[PDB]
Structure 1
């Protein structure tokens, strides 16, 4: 035994399943129509929505 008594500290990670409760119409979401944007490349054209 050396002349000190060290204390250790370590972390453990758990995987859990949650339950989340809320009231009727407590938050309101305001949305518009989805809008499309274009990006052009020769072999493949992509659109963002």
Structure 2
């Protein structure tokens, strides 16, 4: 016995599926017409919307 106790602590993580309830029209979201840009490349062309 070394003459002192040892408290061991430990993180545990669990895969847990929650469930959430909200009131009817609790928040309010504001959206737009989404914009899009034409990023150019040599063989391709990407579009970020």
TM-score (norm. length: structure 2): 0.87
User: What residue ranges of structure 2 are gaps of 5+ in the alignment?
Assistant: none
TM-score (norm. length: structure 1): 0.87
Once residues 30 and 7 of structure 1 are traced to their aligned partners in structure 2, the CA distance between those partners, rounded to angstroms, is 51
Length, aligned pairs only:
49
SS at match of 2:38: strand
Regions of 4+ moved over 3 Å: none
> CA offsets per residue over residues 5-41 of structure 1, 9 Å max, x none?
1111111111111110001111111111111111111
Q: CA RMSD in A?
A: 0.9
